[PDB]
């Protein structure tokens, strides 16, 4: 499992905005808060990336389990880069999975 | 895949000189949302895109230039994969 892209992003949540550090690995998308703590993750095979233009320069990631998460990003170009990188990797992911508590620890440690 | 990921029967069902109402038939599989793209045919103009939920199978496109050829595409987005597009040309 390799790290392909990572960026600070602003997550839009109920009544607030949160600064997150987001990581695209070969098989999953990880959202962390700042030592790192995992807020959530989505396997790429369980993810759908949606462009959001209201608010502007935003995107929404939908998870197969019915949740979705919305982020502001720095530019339309970076937003398009994230979608393309995720698409390229989704073509190489076939199996959904769930990480154990320690697996997540090791995953967050690697960050 | 065992069924097509692509919508069928994309068509303009109503038009004014500056707006189009498009419709398509959904693929066999539940869609998270659709992407609609449109831009001037051959014109090296910026292509624009928007979404509609997978429960909808029509969309309105507005703000177009009259008498201009446009290429319109629709594709489906799914958990884990992106469908291939279906495309039409239409002159306002």
Author numbering:
A (entry chain A): 707 to 740, 750 to 769, 830 to 886
B (entry chain C): 1 to 92
What are the paper's exact sentences on this?
Homology modeling indicated the presence of a unique insertion of 59 amino acids (residues 770–829) between predicted strands β5 and β6 constituting almost a third of the entire Bcr-Abl PH domain. Since the presence of such a large, putatively flexible element can dramatically interfere with any structure determination approaches, we deleted this part of the PH domain. In contrast, crystals of PHΔ770–829 in complex with the same monobody diffracted up to 1.65 Å and allowed structure determination of this complex. The structure of the PH domain comprises the canonical PH domain fold with a β-sandwich, in which four β-strands at the N-terminal part of the protein pack against a 3-stranded C-terminal β-sheet, and a long C-terminal α-helix, displaying high structural similarity for example to the PH domain of Sos1. In addition, our construct further includes a C-terminal helical linker that was required for the stability of the PH domain. Based on our biochemical data, the PH domain forms a 1:1 complex with the monobody, which binds to the β4–β5 loop and the αC helix of the PH domain via its variable FG loop. In the Bcr-Abl PH structure residues K724 and R726 in the β1–β2 hairpin, in addition to K739 and K754 in the β3–β4 hairpin may qualify for the PIP-binding interface. To identify the PIP-binding site of the Bcr-Abl PH domain experimentally, we soaked the PH domain crystals with a soluble PI(4,5)P2 derivative and found additional electron density at the expected site. This density partially fits the PI(4,5)P2 headgroup, although minor sterical clashes remain with the surrounding residues.
